[PDB]
């Protein structure tokens, strides 16, 4: 039991538990009338109206284990309809940020907490944040360009937002889960919902490309295989709901993730294509068909590598001829017409297989002239017309074991019109690395010729992108959006 | 008209209107400059408001009523300040005020002059050769309020000091409805049920002009120096005559005309518009009693004009909580696929007694009946001899069809698992020679990959099965 | 607050040769009735104006059938020998019947006992007689005399034009809907000639060589025609004067081809072609005359016809088989005091100021498994899923969704042997599919790890497991061979 | 349709005309609160399971009471409700209650500001009618009494100041099948009040039933006799009594029949005299199925089968 | 060339610092049921209830007093404890807002118009212990504070009065309880209920519930969980 609120009369009791139900209990004849589905577990219930007209209730949105994503709801008690829902942005961090206790339940799960488990887990998270160096807190965040709409890949959902007025506009489910069909008991809180990892849009903005992973339940037989599901959705500008057009299950075979997904620009097929890339290194370019209303597997480059590493990425030259591929210790250049190496007949050492020092984390070309490749330990800036390196910077004394693979790619972005923007995060320690953070956004231009601007922020920064007004958008550990602009 | 009577204030900023409310007349002042919920009910359902005057130092109105006593009513304090009682059980048929002096017509054909600063009846007066009098005005002749006009179908210019009828203008058949003196020595008289306004010249005792309207007049107003005569019209209209005192030269038509309609098509009637120089204030009723107003420029407005107002005629009840269909705004929408197409990653698109003559005929001309009827065979020597004396490309499209029928009914793949080997055995050189193997045979690759995918899990199951079955064999 | 999400149906990866809505329409064509006739029927023609009727040639008899009833409406039997052709006018009233005496008998429809015109062709029997479509009062007939004749109704005793220049056995001729003057004609030499009527006529404008004997000429497009003869059929463009495409997709030499356009169908243009086996095949010129559907009737089909675009009702596809058969497939389409006390339910509110509503539609009726899964009684959900009369895909949805929502153990707690039996009966019925082998493996292993010793206590489940072991070994044999062929398939790559 | 008209003697015009879809309007009632005096709700129900509440200018606010917090099994229809005041009597606060009929004897009492299932009382048999009587105890406190009536003739008097309890019963003399019970003489639903100090007691109780009979009793002797004798037994109608309505000052009772046309009768009280000079044979009434009074002005609106609401005024008030 | 500015704020900043009280709704409805005021982590957002949208935003960075108090760039302690509708200083002005944060501050501001850029600042005396809860009947104010001398916190009850001087906030030192497990206050605001481990020290059962009246001494009762619970538990 999480919440109990008495009426002014003394015969009604508003109850709230982990199952997502607010139950009005009538005490005389021992009855109840409830609300069984409200997008998350219900933390608090309270009465507001003098004659008992409004129910105010606070919810947790327990799907995010990393963030306690509060939701305030007003309620007209007459017809039990949703009036005045208020919620901020709901990011999904990779782990817990700052002293977020999972609520008190009976059985200790990955979603719930006992009491002794609450104390032991509090000590565990405090000692983890003190001892560990892996503090990444990286959030996948996208911006739909045709409406400049902020998009949060929530756990088993998406949150559509606009930062102009600071209001959540939509919350859409995309996976065949049990987020809203059923309030969860402990043995099904152990059955966590599928995680939608990647959310991108094609540069047309009308096609939304998603990648999610389905988890089978524990103590079963096919609990080892995870189901990779890619999906293509469509929506208009007068309509804020995405409708799923195409589903693709197990791309590149079963149990093989497609962890890097890059959309196509308008120049090739009016941005109706995507390129999926594995730990295998194979590249699948899917495209929307003309006569038929789905997407199809247009181009395939299929090797089969016995070793696997998530240190991959891919970039795309703006005229659609060549593809950069960031492999671990290896940079690859792919033609678009035949999906082979860049065979140049002049042979002027602009080869398709470049050697680099460590695991590549991102490859971003600012134009067809300058290519910024940031590894696990070093950042570099090379040219494309001539195969000579120009710039390089040591990324080791700050990113040592802080991030996993792909997170620097999801972090550092590039505006097509002003240059490159990188991030660094450090911690302010007082005699134990103290939990208070401090970040720095640094702006370069023209393959890091100069630092256009170094701006130190007094707290953590979890994601940076650019809204298509050429203004960069950065996030905080608290659900806060700031804009760096002209 | 629910609003029965109405009158503007000088400088045209407020208007008082009286209207029936459950057979009880309420007076109410609404501003027209940009609601005023203040009113006054009449305590009797018998005494009613008959003649209304606006008085400009507390802002007030003055009401000649059915009881026979003038009610001076302060509107800022919203209270009946004074009751000037007349000495007759009659009705104040007309009211008139200019500064401190007040004149009134009582239905006993009685002139009464009252003083506000005295709060007292100065003089009762009655005159001969005036048997009905339902319009009265005093001429703007300065501080002298004498030589006043009365009018009931025939105008009597009658003095106050000399107290006798001086002039007699031929009026109308029906009594005079409105009688307004715009400037000096010229005054206009209009009857009810009349389209014919009579502009009269006073001292000559004549008709300067006759203004005409297209239908029955409701309300009259004039600007300062006779540059505008605005008549709101009983059908609901606003006909304005610009400079109607200048030079077939006696009768003059309307210069411009303004209606008020709504966006659905419904016309909203007009009552008591007030004009100034180069500025016009028009009035209508939005609800059954609520008065709405608008201001508009008649010089710039053309000869014909209508004012549109978007009335709630068939507006859908829009609510913020409820969506366009079914559910509410906070309802986080779920996941629906509908008829969505599903595709796996291994389906490549856009990248001696034989039966040989029958295979060739069917695969040249596809028939599923011939396909199943010849596929019913299982004899391996027949399989070998057919695929030996079979064409290579016919065998290619046959193997496509084989993968297709295996996928359609997997139960058929038993006798077909030995057939599809010999297609790759005998025509294997042609299968190397073809350039697009995965493109011509994406389906066989798909089904063999799917079975290869199932194989380790079912092997694990079979291990668990064997363990348990040996357990209950031994015990 | 939200609503209850409806239960999401499981969708497999697509199996090859998936159903398009065009094939959905060709299977929506249902209701194939068979009508016996005396000899091989020759020509079927629908009524253009009101397509509720169609005439079929027969033994010395023309039979007009209906469409909404599919019954014999009219029987013309005034002939001496077998009628050769039957074609309607452009105005749906006057039909012509080419006979075997060398004469085309033309009379009005809806009246059998009158003879409006007996147009005498050449003495050799007139094979194909057709009305014009743009013009309303001109005919064209072709005989065994290897001459075609253009006839008017006013001059019925002498032909209007005598079109010549043929070689052998003119058996088809047709017209073009754009030009009412240029005609096409096919004899038994292929070689479709294209003549002009306003000009001389005995010499064509141009020829198009079809080597095997062309049997039907079909003006599909305003720019394209069809050579329908021999084993193949070639679709030409006459404005380019060359064959745009060719299709040799048939077994026997073709005998019939018709075309239909701009009607209630996902495929706008459809081309039917019957080739003397019962085999009628539907292509489409929009997809370059590619195969879209095919029916097979056992008797050798001689004719085929479609209901026109203005059929405004039940759509019909008739195939006349040379055994004397008509195979038609049709896609089919309180007191005064009481009303005066409740007569207000029919206003709908078209005038009032404010309109407000919050009603919801009666949704699709939830099934038994859906109600029990939403009501969380999961074991009885398993039983009502494993009733005998319910489908493999639906119980796959139940199994997948229940394994996702809850666990198999809680689904399987309080089970006895009489409820254990249908689970493993369905498992032995469905282990031989690719779609559900992993899921049935999960569930049967979970029930095994739960009910080890009840299995050793019960003997009637022991015989079912020994039945499972011999059938679980075919994926160890046949699907193991599926991987072996996958190995020797990469050898050819 | 809910048609709101501003009413005059010469021009009776539309303030609002709302239309509901799939929602018949058999009963509709205004409400202004005794605590707030400015709320202006409209409660409306028909042969369905939802009761609409329209609040009081282009977007209309319409809530719907559709769920029952205690039990939805008693009534398969909301087609008849009554509105009333209710003071808590622990806190000196008066709010709005609505009374709804069920199957056999269940009258459901709902807090109307939130659709709350406050109370319920079961009379046996088949529920026929019910009404609200007000009883001022002292200066600042009143208590409401549910006067319900069955078919056979039993009259139940509950109090709802506390939890709903039965104060008393008494039988109507006659009335084999009873249709309408109606108490008048003071503040009722037809003569509402503006403040608590304006609340008085009723005086007379009329019952109008299928044989055309209206038994009229005086409360001052009914409350002490507990098996009372009717002051009058009016029988001037021969069909079903469908509308019993008192004056706002307790001087005329009208009885109207929806079975036959021109079926309205006026009775002066306490003289208990059925009037002669109206309605005449040349009085346009039709099938009289609805009647309504003015609060102060002495006007009468009569709505009939044809959809017409004719208007009269009595000249004394 | 480039300037950074915070644009949008999310999390409603509920009282997670307390973690003992079950009535954690900081947000309250106004006297007129027209506007709902929620104090965010970076702003204070007021929403008109009919149109459902944010009728007013109050950015702590845009103000100069809330930036120097709520938006300190080193400590995250001070969050909004409670809003109060009526004016503490003057009796019943209409569109005023009284903000109590964690550390003894009283910020009086104006909504329904423009925020006058100098909100009334009043520091309450005796702010050694942190402010946890604050409420009122007519005239007198009541403050529940959390004090630390076994990882359990004493609750100190003070009575607050005003209108003697400007800065002065007179305290009365009502009561004190040694340690509390789960305290809650009724919706009327006149009754609270708490527990203690003093009974875990004295007797077998680990708690006893004690209900205490605030503005009087009427309901002051104590009873054990040994009398409350059954034996199957």
Swiss-Prot record, chain A:
GO terms for molecular function: mRNA binding; RNA binding; U3 snoRNA binding. It is found in: Nucleus, Nucleolus. Its main location: nucleus. WD repeats lie at residues 1-35, 191-243, 253-296, 306-346. GO terms for cellular component: 90S preribosome; nucleolus; nucleoplasm; peroxisome; rDNA heterochromatin; small-subunit processome; t-UTP complex. Keywords: Nucleus, Repeat, Ribonucleoprotein, Ribosome biogenesis, rRNA processing, Transcription, WD repeat. It comes from the Eukaryota. GO terms for biological process: maturation of SSU-rRNA; maturation of SSU-rRNA from tricistronic rRNA transcript (SSU-rRNA, 5.8S rRNA, LSU-rRNA); positive regulation of rRNA processing; positive regulation of transcription by RNA polymerase I. Involved in nucleolar processing of pre-18S ribosomal RNA. Required for optimal pre-ribosomal RNA transcription by RNA polymerase I together with a subset of U3 proteins required for transcription (t-UTPs). Present with 6560 molecules/cell in log phase SD medium. Interacts with snoRNA U3. Interacts with MPP10. Component of the ribosomal small subunit (SSU) processome composed of at least 40 protein subunits and snoRNA U3. In the absence of snoRNA3, forms a complex with other t-UTPs. This complex can associate with pre-18S ribosomal RNAs. This is NET1-associated nuclear protein 1. It comes from Saccharomyces cerevisiae (strain ATCC 204508 / S288c). The gene is NAN1. The chain holds residues 300 to 788 of 896 of the full protein.
Curated annotation (Swiss-Prot), chain B:
The gene is UTP5. Transmembrane segments: none annotated. Involved in nucleolar processing of pre-18S ribosomal RNA. Required for optimal pre-ribosomal RNA transcription by RNA polymerase I together with a subset of U3 proteins required for transcription (t-UTPs). Its main location: nucleus. WD repeats lie at residues 12-43, 44-83, 171-210, 212-247, 319-351, 389-429. This is U3 small nucleolar RNA-associated protein 5. One of its GO terms (cellular component) is nucleoplasm. It comes from Saccharomyces cerevisiae (strain ATCC 204508 / S288c) (Baker's yeast). Present with 33100 molecules/cell in log phase SD medium.
Swiss-Prot record, chain D:
It comes from the Eukaryota. GO terms for cellular component: 90S preribosome; nucleolus; nucleoplasm; Pwp2p-containing subcomplex of 90S preribosome; small-subunit processome. The keyword Oxidoreductase does not apply. It is found in: Nucleus, Nucleolus. Involved in nucleolar processing of pre-18S ribosomal RNA and ribosome assembly. Present with 9570 molecules/cell in log phase SD medium. This is U3 small nucleolar RNA-associated protein 18. It comes from Saccharomyces cerevisiae (strain ATCC 204508 / S288c) (Baker's yeast). The gene is UTP18.
Curated annotation (Swiss-Prot), chain E:
One of its GO terms (biological process) is positive regulation of transcription by RNA polymerase I. The keyword Transcription applies. Its main location: nucleus. GO terms for cellular component: 90S preribosome; nucleolus; nucleoplasm; peroxisome; rDNA heterochromatin; small-subunit processome; t-UTP complex. Keywords: Nucleus, Repeat, Ribonucleoprotein, Ribosome biogenesis, rRNA processing, Transcription, WD repeat. It comes from the Eukaryota. One of its GO terms (molecular function) is RNA binding. It is found in: Nucleus, Nucleolus. Present with 6560 molecules/cell in log phase SD medium. Involved in nucleolar processing of pre-18S ribosomal RNA. Required for optimal pre-ribosomal RNA transcription by RNA polymerase I together with a subset of U3 proteins required for transcription (t-UTPs). Interacts with snoRNA U3. Interacts with MPP10. Component of the ribosomal small subunit (SSU) processome composed of at least 40 protein subunits and snoRNA U3. In the absence of snoRNA3, forms a complex with other t-UTPs. This complex can associate with pre-18S ribosomal RNAs. This is NET1-associated nuclear protein 1. It comes from Saccharomyces cerevisiae (strain ATCC 204508 / S288c) (Baker's yeast). The gene is NAN1.
